[PDB]
Design an enzyme around this catalytic site. Structure first.
Site, mmCIF file in Angstrom:
data_model
loop_
_atom_site.group_PDB
_atom_site.id
_atom_site.type_symbol
_atom_site.label_atom_id
_atom_site.label_comp_id
_atom_site.label_asym_id
_atom_site.label_seq_id
_atom_site.Cartn_x
_atom_site.Cartn_y
_atom_site.Cartn_z
ATOM 1 C CD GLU A 65 -21.320 -49.017 35.171
ATOM 2 O OE1 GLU A 65 -21.625 -48.486 36.252
ATOM 3 O OE2 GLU A 65 -20.872 -48.367 34.201
ATOM 4 C CG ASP A 93 -19.993 -49.949 30.693
ATOM 5 O OD1 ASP A 93 -20.320 -49.495 31.806
ATOM 6 O OD2 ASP A 93 -20.378 -49.451 29.616
ATOM 7 C CE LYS A 119 -20.975 -43.803 26.570
ATOM 8 N NZ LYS A 119 -19.932 -44.466 27.393
HETATM 9 C C1 LIG Z 1 -24.625 -42.049 37.831
HETATM 10 O O1 LIG Z 1 -24.858 -42.626 36.561
HETATM 11 C C2 LIG Z 1 -23.957 -43.661 36.238
HETATM 12 C C3 LIG Z 1 -22.599 -43.499 36.508
HETATM 13 C C4 LIG Z 1 -21.707 -44.520 36.197
HETATM 14 C C5 LIG Z 1 -20.178 -44.352 36.470
HETATM 15 C C6 LIG Z 1 -19.498 -43.742 35.212
HETATM 16 N N1 LIG Z 1 -20.537 -43.646 34.164
HETATM 17 C C7 LIG Z 1 -20.636 -44.678 33.139
HETATM 18 O O2 LIG Z 1 -19.890 -45.600 33.156
HETATM 19 C C8 LIG Z 1 -21.778 -44.601 32.093
HETATM 20 N N2 LIG Z 1 -22.678 -43.460 32.106
HETATM 21 C C9 LIG Z 1 -23.802 -43.380 31.113
HETATM 22 C C10 LIG Z 1 -24.743 -42.132 31.143
HETATM 23 C C11 LIG Z 1 -24.054 -41.078 32.065
HETATM 24 C C12 LIG Z 1 -24.571 -40.878 33.335
HETATM 25 C C13 LIG Z 1 -23.986 -39.951 34.200
HETATM 26 C C14 LIG Z 1 -22.864 -39.219 33.786
HETATM 27 C C15 LIG Z 1 -22.337 -39.419 32.513
HETATM 28 C C16 LIG Z 1 -22.916 -40.337 31.644
HETATM 29 C C17 LIG Z 1 -22.265 -40.497 30.263
HETATM 30 F F1 LIG Z 1 -21.446 -39.423 30.062
HETATM 31 F F2 LIG Z 1 -21.510 -41.637 30.253
HETATM 32 F F3 LIG Z 1 -23.181 -40.533 29.252
HETATM 33 N N3 LIG Z 1 -24.013 -44.465 30.125
HETATM 34 C C18 LIG Z 1 -23.121 -45.621 30.115
HETATM 35 O O3 LIG Z 1 -23.290 -46.488 29.325
HETATM 36 C C19 LIG Z 1 -21.988 -45.707 31.106
HETATM 37 O O4 LIG Z 1 -21.129 -46.819 31.103
HETATM 38 C C20 LIG Z 1 -22.173 -45.689 35.616
HETATM 39 C C21 LIG Z 1 -23.527 -45.851 35.337
HETATM 40 C C22 LIG Z 1 -24.405 -44.837 35.655
HETATM 41 O O5 LIG Z 1 -25.756 -45.032 35.359
HETATM 42 MN MN LIG Z 2 -21.905 -48.000 29.461
HETATM 43 MN MN LIG Z 3 -19.755 -47.460 32.579
#
Ligand SMILES: COc1cc(CCNC(=O)c2nc(Cc3ccccc3C(F)(F)F)[nH]c(=O)c2O)ccc1O
Ligand SMILES: [Mn+2]
Ligand SMILES: [Mn+2]
Ligand SMILES: C[C@H](C[C@@H](C[C@H](C[C@@H](C[C@@H](CCN1CCCC1=O)N1CCCC1=O)N1CCCC1=O)N1CCCC1=O)N1CCCC1=O)N1CCCC1=O
Length: 180
Positions: A65, A93, A119
């Site tokens: 992450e 992450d 999840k």
């Molecule tokens: C732009 O937003 C983010 C993008 C990223 C890169 C890859 N995304 C995650 O790694 C991740 N995304 C989320 C919530 C989220 C938000 C946007 C799209 C999809 C999703 C999910 F499908 F996963 F629910 N919740 C996590 O715990 C998580 O690790 C990391 C943090 C972010 O805030």
């Molecule tokens: Mn996460």
């Molecule tokens: Mn993530």
């Protein structure tokens, strides 16, 4: 333009974390200035991940992450191609070097039970450890294996409840809780 939330977020979190959240959002279409509850959630998620890696030893974790999409996947493939673990469907992450597994961190504004179920069904690849935190103080880990020591997890819960309080004292909490 001109939301209380956006000004609170850049005031509650570290500038480097705000910058990483900003960049992470734009990379995925979201805009931090209109989607401000998401903006708030992304910083919290980022900080929780960083404190998590701050737990344990210095070589314990590899942080996925925070990196940009393409280099994150590159480190994943390197970790898979060197340790033999199977590549996960979605970007995790963290990677635990002691326990030999990927870790998926969650921060939720509902009972930890539902978010974990969602999840756990989003990946269905197993192996990849899931660790969920709530804003009230509940946590939730695969196989009841919470990875880090109690004091390191208690720090994270404490910070999460401080964020909740600063939001409520400024009246952004209710809208933030409903946005998820
Ligand atoms: C732009 O937003 C983010 C993008 C990223 C890169 C890859 N995304 C995650 O790694 C991740 N995304 C989320 C919530 C989220 C938000 C946007 C799209 C999809 C999703 C999910 F499908 F996963 F629910 N919740 C996590 O715990 C998580 O690790 C990391 C943090 C972010 O805030
Ligand atoms: Mn996460
Ligand atoms: Mn993530
Ligand atoms: C390693 C470097 C940046 C790290 C970011 C990560 C965040 C860290 C902030 C530091 C400052 N600390 C440490 C003491 C308190 C503090 O505030 N913490 C930890 C607590 C909350 C927080 O914010 N850490 C951890 C090690 C040092 C550091 O900076 N990141 C960003 C994503 C990937 C990564 O490894 N890298 C690596 C290459 C690109 C880059 O920028």
């Amino acid at each position: 333009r001109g939301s209380h939330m956006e000004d609170f977020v850049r005031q509650c979190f570290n500038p480097m974390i705000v910058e990483l959240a900003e960049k992470a959002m734009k990379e995925y279409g979201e805009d931090p200035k209109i989607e401000t509850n998401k903006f708030a959630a992304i910083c919290t998620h980022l900080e929780v991940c960083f404190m998590y890696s701050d737990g344990g030893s210095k070589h314990r974790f590899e942080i996925i992450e925070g990196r940009d999409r393409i280099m994150a996947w590159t480190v994943v493939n390197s970790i898979c191609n060197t340790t033999g673990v199977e590549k996960p469907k979605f970007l995790p992450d963290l990677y635990d070097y002691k326990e030999n597994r990927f870790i998926e961190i969650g921060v939720t504004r509902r009972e930890v039970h539902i978010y974990y179920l969602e999840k756990a069904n989003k990946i269905k690849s197993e192996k990849t450890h899931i660790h969920i935190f709530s804003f009230t103080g509940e946590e939730m880990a695969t196989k009841a294996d919470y990875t880090l020591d109690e004091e390191s997890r208690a720090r994270i819960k404490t910070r999460l409840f401080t964020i909740r309080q600063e939001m409520a004292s400024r009246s952004l909490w209710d809208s933030f809780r409903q946005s998820e």
